[PDB]
């Protein structure tokens, strides 16, 4: 797998192997973030495996990943949902198209991404890939927002940023 | 380093090497838990390092540890605060002396402990020890308590059990006063 390097204006300029790409000096690249809800409207929150290079063991929104060259964001979401969670989903919907962020994890590993945000509903049972996900919780979106608002440090920095953007929170609040 | 083994009634029967002790079938042993507040009354919350054998990478209260032979529970608090956090403290106050818990961690390691709970003030700057703590935050107690209420699964189970104990929570609240 790779990541897609982006210039200032967001234009793809080349690629890097994905593992090699995330370092203390990560360069800007393309990503996505997804928030998954089940048919009952519960939010899936996941805990990243301790083997992930960036933010291992961190609670976060359902699924993130890295679109490959010429892959649509919707297809990347679908792909990683299958890969990380063995789950089938409805067509992903746009909830925060212009999200972009840079952050450094506790060991000094940086994410630096153009990271459009989506939401979808699961249409099958999860089947967990424990190389990616070490724990998960189905919960009310309302409670998750309360926890994000009270102890943001207990969640990934991008999950906090996405959830605290007015429009994004508005749009996630509707999948319930 | 060892742990002090306890029987049925809470009576020590011997010691066991610490690493060897914590397994899928951990025996009952002595521990402690401490909640630390700075002068301003903020609570120190910490994130266990990824290398901890039990609940690695989990957010929790300030410091937990295991009294050793000849050591009082309070001196163990003092020692671990220095070892894990580099920090000096005021005399630890007993806020939940009867706390006991058993729990299995995400990879199946069991903790099975008599774990009196304390609170104290820090009196020096932190010098975090990265072999034990990977992250930390100074917070308002109320915020932490709201977080635990909302998403209890995001924290260590013992942190949540202690914080929702009415008596222990009242003492935690007393430590939020600003103290020069
Ligand atoms: Mg991912
Ligand atoms: Mg400890
Ligand atoms: Mn990335
Ligand atoms: Mn123990």
- What gap in Å lies between CA B131 and CA B77, rounded to an integer? 18
Q: Is the CB of B45 less than 8 angstroms away from the CB of A139?
A: no
- What gap in Å lies between CA A150 and CA A133, rounded to an integer? 24
> CB–CB of A121/A128 below 8 Å?
no
> CB–CB of B96/B12 below 8 Å?
no
3-state class (DSSP) for residue A85: helix
DSSP 8-state class, residue B90:
P
Rounded (10°) CA dihedral B87, B75, B97, B161: 40
The size of chain B, in residues, is: 180
3-state class (DSSP) for residue B26: coil
Q: Residue ranges of the alpha helices (H) in chain B?
A: 18-21, 73-85, 141-150, 157-163, 166-174
Q: Is the CB of B59 less than 8 angstroms away from the CB of A154?
A: yes
Neighbours of A53 (CB within 10 A): 16
Distance from CA of A157 to the nearest CA of B (A): 13
- Minimum-distance CB partner of B143 among A47, A56, A150: A150
> CB–CB of A136/A130 below 8 Å?
no
Nearest to B84 by CA among B40, B39, B134, B154: B134
DSSP 8-state class, residue B155:
B
Residue of B nearest to A139 (CA): B151
Question: Encoding tokens for residue B129?
Answer: 């020890």
Question: Encoding tokens for residue A168?
Answer: 């994004």
CATH number, domain containing residue B147: 3.90.79.10
Distance from CA of A57 to the nearest CA of B (A): 5
Question: Any residues with CB less than 8 A from the CB of B38 and at least 6 apart, and which?
Answer: B44, B121, B122, B138
Cα A135 to Cα A12, A106, B162: the distances in Å are 34, 20, 23
Please check if A64 is assigned to a binding site. Answer: yes
Between the two ends of chain B, the Cα-to-Cα distance in Å is 36
- Minimum-distance CB partner of B106 among A56, A135, A155: A135
- What gap in Å lies between CA B154 and CA A114, rounded to an integer? 27
- What gap in Å lies between CA B118 and CA B171, rounded to an integer? 9
3-state class (DSSP) for residue A140: coil
DSSP 8-state class, residue B154:
G
Question: Encoding tokens for residue B16?
Answer: 């066991």
Q: Which residues span the domain enclosing A6? A: 1-176
- What gap in Å lies between CA A27 and CA A14, rounded to an integer? 11
Burial category of A5 from C-beta neighbours within 10 Å (exposed 0-12, middle 13-18, buried 19 and up): middle
Question: Encoding tokens for residue B78?
Answer: 């003092």
- What gap in Å lies between CA B36 and CA B81, rounded to an integer? 9
Q: Which helix (H) or strand (E) segment is B81 a member of?
A: helix B73-85
Number of folded domains that form chain A = 1
Q: Is the CB of B154 less than 8 angstroms away from the CB of A151?
A: yes
Q: Is the CB of A57 less than 8 angstroms away from the CB of B45?
A: no
Question: Encoding tokens for residue B81?
Answer: 């605060």
Residue of A nearest to B50 (CA): A50
Residue holding tokens 């507040």? B37
Contacts of B105 in chain A (CB under 8 A): none
Distance from CA of A12 to the nearest CA of B (A): 34
Contacts of B58 in chain A (CB under 8 A): 57
Residue holding tokens 């063995």? A86
Residue of A nearest to B144 (CA): A151
What secondary structure does DSSP assign to A5-48, as a single string?
A: EE-TTS-EEEEEEHHHH-STTPPPEE-EEEEEE-TT--EEEEEE
Residues at Cβ < 5 Å from ligand 1 ion: A 64-65
- What gap in Å lies between CA B109 and CA A156, rounded to an integer? 25
- What gap in Å lies between CA B156 and CA B171, rounded to an integer? 20
Question: Encoding tokens for residue B93?
Answer: 């106050």
Question: Encoding tokens for residue A9?
Answer: 């204006």
3-state class (DSSP) for residue A87: coil
Q: Is the CB of A154 less than 8 angstroms away from the CB of B153?
A: no
- CA dihedral for A106, A107, A110, A116, sign (positive or negative): negative
Question: Encoding tokens for residue A97?
Answer: 């198209």
Question: Encoding tokens for residue B98?
Answer: 């009867």
**Method by which the coordinates were obtained:** X-ray
Q: Which helix (H) or strand (E) segment is B172 a member of?
A: helix B166-174
Which of B154, B159, B160 is best to mutate for the A interface (most A CBs within 10 A)? B154
- Whether A64 is a known active-site residue: answer yes
- Please tell me the number of Cα atoms within 13 Å of A52 on its side-chain side: 26
Neighbours of A3 (CB within 10 A): 26
Cα A38 to Cα A176, B7, B58: the distances in Å are 9, 46, 26
Contacts of B156 in chain A (CB under 8 A): none
Rounded (10°) CA dihedral A112, A56, A64, A42: -140
DSSP lists the bridge partners of residue A138 as A44
Distance from CA of A141 to the nearest CA of B (A): 10
3-state class (DSSP) for residue B170: helix
What value, to the nearest 5°, has the Cα angle with vertex A55 and ends A100 and B106? 140
Question: Encoding tokens for residue B101?
Answer: 């818990």
Residue holding tokens 């990616």? A132
Between the two ends of chain A, the Cα-to-Cα distance in Å is 34
Neighbours of B20 (CB within 10 A): 9
Residue holding tokens 């899928």? B24
Neighbours of B159 (CB within 10 A): 23
> CB–CB of B10/B77 below 8 Å?
no
- Minimum-distance CB partner of A147 among B45, B57, B154: B154
């Amino acid at each position: 797998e790779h990541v897609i390097l982006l210039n200032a204006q967001g234009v793809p300029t080349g690629t890097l192997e994905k593992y090699a790409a995330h370092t203390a000096d990560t360069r800007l690249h393309l990503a996505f973030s997804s928030w998954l809800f089940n048919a009952k409207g519960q939010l899936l929150v996941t805990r990243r495996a301790l083997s992930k290079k960036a933010w291992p063991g961190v609670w976060t929104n359902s699924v993130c990943g890295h679109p490959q060259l010429g892959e649509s964001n919707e297809d990347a979401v679908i792909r990683r949902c299958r890969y990380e969670l063995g789950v089938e989903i409805t067509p992903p919907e746009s909830i925060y198209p212009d999200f972009r962020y840079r952050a450094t994890d506790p060991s000094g590993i940086v994410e630096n991404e153009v990271c459009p945000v989506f939401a979808a509903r699961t249409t099958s049972a999860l089947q967990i890939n424990d190389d990616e996900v070490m724990d998960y919780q189905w919960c009310d979106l309302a409670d998750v927002l309360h926890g994000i608002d009270a102890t943001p440090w207990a969640f990934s920095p991008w999950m906090v940023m996405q959830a605290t953007n007015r429009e994004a929170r508005k749009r996630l609040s509707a999948f319930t």
